[PDB]
Amino acid sequence: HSDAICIGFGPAGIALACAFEDAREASQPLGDLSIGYLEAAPDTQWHRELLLAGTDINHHVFRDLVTPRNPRSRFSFAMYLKDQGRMFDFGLLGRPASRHEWSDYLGWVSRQVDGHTRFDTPVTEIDPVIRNGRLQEVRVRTPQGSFATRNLVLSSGSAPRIPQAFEALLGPTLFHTSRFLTRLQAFGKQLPKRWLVLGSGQSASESVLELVSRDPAIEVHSVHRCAGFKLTQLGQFPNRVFAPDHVDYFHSLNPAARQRFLDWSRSTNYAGIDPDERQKLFSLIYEDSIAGRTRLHTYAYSVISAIEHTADGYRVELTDTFSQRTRVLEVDAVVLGTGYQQYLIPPLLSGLQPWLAADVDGGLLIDRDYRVATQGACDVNIWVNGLSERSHGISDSQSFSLMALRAGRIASALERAVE
Amino acid sequence: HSDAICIGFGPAGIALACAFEDAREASQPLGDLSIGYLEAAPDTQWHRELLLAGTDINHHVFRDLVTPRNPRSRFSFAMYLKDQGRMFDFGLLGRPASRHEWSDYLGWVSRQVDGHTRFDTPVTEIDPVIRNGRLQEVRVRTPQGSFATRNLVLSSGSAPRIPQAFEALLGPTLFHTSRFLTRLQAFGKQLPKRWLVLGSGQSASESVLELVSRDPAIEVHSVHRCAGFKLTQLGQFPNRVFAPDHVDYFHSLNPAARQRFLDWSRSTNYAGIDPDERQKLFSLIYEDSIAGRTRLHTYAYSVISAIEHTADGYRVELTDTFSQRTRVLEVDAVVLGTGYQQYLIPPLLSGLQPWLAADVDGGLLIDRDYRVATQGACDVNIWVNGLSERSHGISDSQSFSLMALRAGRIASALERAVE
Amino acid sequence: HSDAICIGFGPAGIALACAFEDAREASQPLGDLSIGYLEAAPDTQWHRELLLAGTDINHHVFRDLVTPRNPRSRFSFAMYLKDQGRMFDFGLLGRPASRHEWSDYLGWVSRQVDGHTRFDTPVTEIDPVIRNGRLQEVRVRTPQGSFATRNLVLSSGSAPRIPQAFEALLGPTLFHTSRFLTRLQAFGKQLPKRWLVLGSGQSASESVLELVSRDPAIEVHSVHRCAGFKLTQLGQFPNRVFAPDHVDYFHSLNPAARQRFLDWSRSTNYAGIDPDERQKLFSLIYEDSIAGRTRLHTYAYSVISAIEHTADGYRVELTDTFSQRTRVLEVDAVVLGTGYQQYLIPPLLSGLQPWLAADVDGGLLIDRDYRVATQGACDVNIWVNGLSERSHGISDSQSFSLMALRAGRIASALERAVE
Amino acid sequence: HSDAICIGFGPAGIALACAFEDAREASQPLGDLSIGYLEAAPDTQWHRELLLAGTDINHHVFRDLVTPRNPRSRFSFAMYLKDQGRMFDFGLLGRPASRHEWSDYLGWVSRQVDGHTRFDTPVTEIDPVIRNGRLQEVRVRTPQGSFATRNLVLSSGSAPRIPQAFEALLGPTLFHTSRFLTRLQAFGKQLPKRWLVLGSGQSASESVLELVSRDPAIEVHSVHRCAGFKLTQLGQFPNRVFAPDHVDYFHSLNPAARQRFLDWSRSTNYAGIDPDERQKLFSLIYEDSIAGRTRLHTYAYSVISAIEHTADGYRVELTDTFSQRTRVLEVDAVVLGTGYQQYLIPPLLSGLQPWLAADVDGGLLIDRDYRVATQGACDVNIWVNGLSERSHGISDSQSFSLMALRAGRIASALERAVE
Secondary structure, three states: OOOEEEEOOOHHHHHHHHHHHHHHHOOOHHHHOOEEEEOOOOOOHHHHHHHHOOOOOOOOOOOOOOOOOOOOOOOOHHHHHHHHOOHHHHHHHOOOOOHHHHHHHHHHHHHHHOOOEEOOOOOOEEEEEEOOOOEEEEEEEEOOEEEEEOEEEEOOOOOEOOOHHHHOOOEOOEEEHHHHHHHHHHOOOOOOOEEEEEOOOHHHHHHHHHHHHHOOOOEEEEEOOOOOHHHOEEOOHHHOOOHHHHHHHHHHOOHHHHHHHHHHHHHHOOOEEOHHHHHHHHHHHHHHHHOOOOOEEEEOOEEEEEEEEEOOEEEEEEEEOOOOOEEEEEEOEEEEOOOEOOOOOOHHHHHHHHHEOOOOOOOOOEOOOOEEOEOOEOOOEEEEOOOOHHHHOOOOOOOHHHHHHHHHHHHHHHHHOOO | OOOEEEEOOOHHHHHHHHHHHHHHHOOOHHHHOOEEEEOOOOOOHHHHHHHHOOOOOOOOOOOOOOOOOOOOOOOOHHHHHHHHOOHHHHHHHOOOOOHHHHHHHHHHHHHHHOOOEEOOOOOOEEEEEEOOOOEEEEEEEEOOEEEEEOEEEEOOOOOEOOOHHHHOOOEOOEEEHHHHHHHHHHOOOOOOOEEEEEOOOHHHHHHHHHHHHHOOOOEEEEEOOOOOHHHOEEOOHHHOOOHHHHHHHHHHOOHHHHHHHHHHHHHHOOOEEOHHHHHHHHHHHHHHHHOOOOOEEEEOOEEEEEEEEEOOEEEEEEEEOOOOOEEEEEEOEEEEOOOEOOOOOOHHHHHHHHHEOOOOOOOOOEOOOOEEOEOOEOOOEEEEOOOOHHHHOOOOOOOHHHHHHHHHHHHHHHHHOOO | OOOEEEEOOOHHHHHHHHHHHHHHHOOOHHHHOOEEEEOOOOOOHHHHHHHHOOOOOOOOOOOOOOOOOOOOOOOOHHHHHHHHOOHHHHHHHOOOOOHHHHHHHHHHHHHHHOOOEEOOOOOOEEEEEEOOOOEEEEEEEEOOEEEEEOEEEEOOOOOEOOOHHHHOOOEOOEEEHHHHHHHHHHOOOOOOOEEEEEOOOHHHHHHHHHHHHHOOOOEEEEEOOOOOHHHOEEOOHHHOOOHHHHHHHHHHOOHHHHHHHHHHHHHHOOOEEOHHHHHHHHHHHHHHHHOOOOOEEEEOOEEEEEEEEEOOEEEEEEEEOOOOOEEEEEEOEEEEOOOEOOOOOOHHHHHHHHHEOOOOOOOOOEOOOOEEOEOOEOOOEEEEOOOOHHHHOOOOOOOHHHHHHHHHHHHHHHHHOOO | OOOEEEEOOOHHHHHHHHHHHHHHHOOOHHHHOOEEEEOOOOOOHHHHHHHHOOOOOOOOOOOOOOOOOOOOOOOOHHHHHHHHOOHHHHHHHOOOOOHHHHHHHHHHHHHHHOOOEEOOOOOOEEEEEEOOOOEEEEEEEEOOEEEEEOEEEEOOOOOEOOOHHHHOOOEOOEEEHHHHHHHHHHOOOOOOOEEEEEOOOHHHHHHHHHHHHHOOOOEEEEEOOOOOHHHOEEOOHHHOOOHHHHHHHHHHOOHHHHHHHHHHHHHHOOOEEOHHHHHHHHHHHHHHHHOOOOOEEEEOOEEEEEEEEEOOEEEEEEEEOOOOOEEEEEEOEEEEOOOEOOOOOOHHHHHHHHHEOOOOOOOOOEOOOOEEOEOOEOOOEEEEOOOOHHHHOOOOOOOHHHHHHHHHHHHHHHHHOOO
16 A cells, blocks of 8 residues: 555656655655556666657757756756766767667666666556445556555556557567567568568658668568658657647647547648658668669558468558559568557556546546546546547657656645645 | 740749750750740849748759759859859858859849840730631730740749738738838838738748847737647758659549549648748747747637728737637738739630630649640640649749759750741 | 955856855755855946857857756756746757857856855955964955955956057057957947957957948958968867866876977967857858958968057058068957966965965966965965966866866865865 | 870879860860870779778768869769769758768769770889980880870879888788778678777778777777877868968968978868768767777877787887876787878889979979979970878868869860970
């Protein structure tokens, strides 16, 4: 039993722990609240680096896990650089920090605030506890025991979107971007030559780049539902505008207007790629072409209309959505840069449905402070620590600065809920 | 009587003359064809600078009026720099050439190929000439006489889009971006304080910048149909992709698919601004805010739902398209960055309608080589030297490189048509 | 009587006060030490902006007045941005902060740590206090009274270098860069046309830029002892390398080797200009030249060998140092970007000479911690809070980060000296 | 027998051939002059890429082998891009062309103008031909025969500077940068771990980068006579200023003043590195350090005062020039980035000394048009197609634009000399 349980100790949960630790170290009341963290994965560099993949880190160095909420925090990137002796040299770089550096930073913060974190500890189920015909507690169930609380934070996220056509095919030679590194490693010393990469966002771009980087004979077929990479937005949304203002506006709309907004928003099609990532991919392809190798093939306005696994790889049928013209590609492997599914009700909350209010789609009803609206519940609070189009008008991001700000809103709400 | 008449001696017509002059100077057959040019405006720096406004010139220096068609042309920008003694210093700049420099270049080319151009010579009408019950010639009519030809090129463009709500109001204090400079000059030494600028493209951006640049007390209200300037595309379309490939794809679609493409294309909403222009505007506003002046006000997802001219300026009602919430602004002047109208049939071709084929909207039917399809016509050819969404899938651009390429296609087609 | 007196409340003294305030607010012992600050100039934005002139601020935002010493300080630039509500927009700029912004920051810090500062309070003299035939105290004398201390910090700097040839001429039409703004303002609404600007550093560059910016008919003659602006180093020294490592190396040399080092160092001639300043000046001159105005004239390898004030401005004789060829220029005004004199013994320490050790040139003998070495003194300490070639191997800089680091070394040394 | 012989068919000789071919194709008189080219090396991509090494190609694309002399040449980079179909994509890169691209360009030009070039044809000696007691011809001697001419162009350059201390040591594990690639290849699949790289210019930088790039365990000791790479000039000289103006000024000095100029010039120490090369090296080292590897060690103000080859690599003694402090390094291999020797009289002109005038150092006396001054010679002309400090005030560069301009001056001088 603790005052709260947070599920997930990725950046979002770390950011939240940093708010509590800032408070503890400053002797403020919030620091007394006891919170435990349950993370399914192990405490490893590999896993933290897995978490940053697909994320646009072409942003200012102040937009770290704590500074936008509290620049005096001992977990700021400036404190990280100073501890590592690199403040001056970092400034001379003239570029934003690398993914690898942000990972290291993230391990450096984690290591300092993880005293209440249980790793290798997946949540398998969350069971209700009813007492007077009304929900009073929940029991978070894990392989290493169970935990009880009135206050729950979900900081674990959502799952890969795998269209039905591909589910039977998931394997070593056809996989989602979320397992890109692991899957590539399984090939050992020899990658297959012919690749198809589906999708138009940063995860797709980085996969393409990594494939044409690893082996000079690899050929990549890059399929886009709309225009290709050359017409994507430069920078992911949270790096172009101050997202909380857009989250505010979205909450100020009534549900009918929200749906009109999302229909416009979805057809506007904002999907953005770090401009340095675009540049790396375009420059490398260009250099390749000087020697005659043209190794990236682009198919715009296309969907995969059929696919089968044969003895000689995959036979993939593309259909151009406008012309209806079709063509067939034979490849050795396929990468799905299809992104992640927005849950209506996260699977872990399955058993609590009777005490959860319904939004217009039956899913979770989430307020501006990330709190889940309940019904027939006595003192039980739940927060979902992330963005979504359906609740907030914006796709979920691994933006460190957004996590910092959310952590502030949640940690304060958690304090009020214990008095 | 000449073998051809080109209407317009802006960049597009100059580019075309450069193809003929290249050919003449090289002794090639195309140089013998006699062509005259009729330009409504005078031969002045002011007018040439008026023509470049709103245009993204953040492109490579090779994408000039001739080089993409013929790098050996004596009208290349490299030859311009060498003639002016600035080749070395230009390279040291590390930035793209300025609008002012491209204007000067353009006057420098014009001055060398304008021996067949009649300026201050507007076309008021174009009359048919029928002989055997079929159209054999046209008579281009001007205030300074008339001209006869079987071969006509329209390089004059299209007109400002002025919504009905504003037509009665056009004047010194409410105007289109195409007269921005002229109108601003009329105020002399004192601009009005409160401005409304409607629109989201580069012409809107540059107007805003110029207004907040000219006077530190000016306040600008910037109204956008969708998201504001911070979410526009960086770079206009022809600077992001090789437009002719997209023009090819659009022509390869049948008319039903073209309409499906434009419906998608129009909701995707690509409207782009030179990234240095965005940067100039954002930096200046930011610097202003350090001293407390917040002088640019943004209204997204908004339309003007009512406007009236009172004794104290304009009273403007905005409606947020999603929320339906309204608000009122009082301003002293209004700038319409509404862009330009695509004609279905340009006004100058009014009298030739009976010999012009019809596209799906009754307008001109234009092929991939910019030729207008005719009916019941003997040897008479017409070209429209520009882009449009309806014929080519792309908005009309003042892209110098595109003009160069078009000039090649048209000048060759003109040669074949005289034998 | 206070434990210490610091003379100067420019950035250097502010940085020092920030160390004490950080300590006070954290309850650390250093915060108990009482220190007063005497600043000759008034507490005004004009004066703070006067202090930043000539300074390369093209450096990373962490290199502020406190962060390199203590990122958790409440006076960090991140805390400044957050207080002003500009953290997100600052990141979107993609450029370093402007001089104007750093000034504002500096006023924002000053306002929070100036409770022990007396402004408009010049030090006219510092008198010794001898007791047992040995120096025990000093009496800092001002127009508003006198102050006694064993611990003295000089944070006031040094004076403009005015060669003998110019001293009689100093006036409204011939002046040093340190009074550039004040002097320009005296002209009111009309500047003179013909200017000569002597010097090759950033103060010279910025003067040139400001002159050709203010008036399109102004002509500037820019005279350089060596090569001109196009061959200056990009960035001032402290922005190219971590200066303290170079200060360390210089202290590790014995005096004979130091002189050999400075002779090499002085002939290497490192004088650097913010690359954006060079760019602004070169771009503007280039744009000017498109229209025919060539308004900046450069004379390399030149000295002024004679000058006289006539009724028609100045008659200036230049001599090329290599060729010995001479020429005469007639100008209306002259700007001396000659920099600042390194004192051997600052004038304010005149009366303490008998208790001050001598370096190889008779001047102050300063250790690595900025302490002045004394003789026959009981408990009396003096620090000079700045760099110099003669003591530290580097020219004095207004580098904010260096001030932060020095402040740490001095404030700790001050603490030890009071127990 | 031909009207002229040019020794060397690297960029300089290719540039010269382009002037003749431009003239031939335009029917101008210069095209009739017969000239043959003798190149020692073979016609291979490997060799052309060997020629560009150490060269700052961070310059504008107009500064190619022909354009600064004649933008209409069919050998312009714009014509190259157009022939390869890459003009548009090149512009989208937003960076300067790569070394690899400039090599390809250079092969593309060579292939079009090499019809008078004999490859694998070294000049071993050049013998005089005296007739009336005065020199009338020269006989260029090669392994494949001999050639006679009154007009000689030397476009072969100069030799690696190898200090005496190293001559006996030249081998697979200690080599000059000019054989860096060849030597590295000899190691096959395993490079040695510990490297010393001597020197401060671009060849040194690129060697360092390539070594730390090839193998993550390699350690590099980088020794500099003065300050290290962080204080080098950004950009080589010809990319910072218009070199011909500086060559003009140097020729306008009398010999006594030239020596004073070079003494200043040599102590100013301008040696420049492509800013993107510095950036690549600094970024990679920085990224390495995040994981704990610090693999580049810098020694400023140092010379190698002793070195010996032992059974366990090299034992190298460094002496700091100022402190006189020494230290010893043990490394497995050494790279000499010592640059190239300026000949006083090139070895190939050994036998013509009696007909060659003497400059102040006994060496060649070369005018502003690159002509060698002779004595007692009837109609015999020689040109050295390169820069040098001793004749022109500037170090020899592989600047393509400079070659273009020189080619113009030489080809015209060659024409006058045949009538």
